[PDB]
Amino acid sequence: ACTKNAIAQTGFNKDKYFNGDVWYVTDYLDLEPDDVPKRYCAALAAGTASGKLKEALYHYDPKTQDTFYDVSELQVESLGKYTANFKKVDKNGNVKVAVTAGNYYTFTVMYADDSSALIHTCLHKGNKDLGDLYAVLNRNKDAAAGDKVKSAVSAATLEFSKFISTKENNCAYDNDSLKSLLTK
Ligand SMILES: [C-]#N
Secondary structure, eight states, X not given: OOOOOOOOOTTOOHHHHTEEEEEEEEEEEESSOOSOXXXXXXXXXXXXXXXXXXXEEEEEOTTTOOEEEEEEEEEEEETTEEXXXXXXXXXXXXEEEOOOTTOEEEEEEEEEOSSEEEEEEEEEOTTOOOOEEEEEEESSTTOOOOHHHHHHHXXXXXXXXXXXXXXXXOOOOXXXXXXXXXXX
């Protein structure tokens, strides 16, 4: 279960974050880890599409090869905090699993600037038992986390040394499909 009410970044600039570009997860903190794919890759695009706030997600287990994309319509709870009802899609946006109540994640942007961000998310999917996930994002997939986002981790009363890096996983991304998915 999720336990954190994440605080959104003061002064969060939604138009800069939701600019239709791609964000790569470089480091993440699963508060309730299992015997985890401690090998994971994830990336997302976030943007406004025909007036609608959207996110496209990509997940890839580099060991199992399990792959999936998602498109979501975001609803605003407050500045920097969103509820997203996701649908699973192929890379072209064809629906594989339709939007369904009970399938949603919340997402809070705790810190962001033009190159980096820290987010909190809470996934709800069916009768899955899921917990809080924090993720350090960068505009460049190979960027080591800088002082601004690591300080924000600390300000969140989290330890960055506990975050798991994805950089060792040899991830490759279809950033083109993520951007085009924003419109689907
Ligand atoms: C993925 N939570």
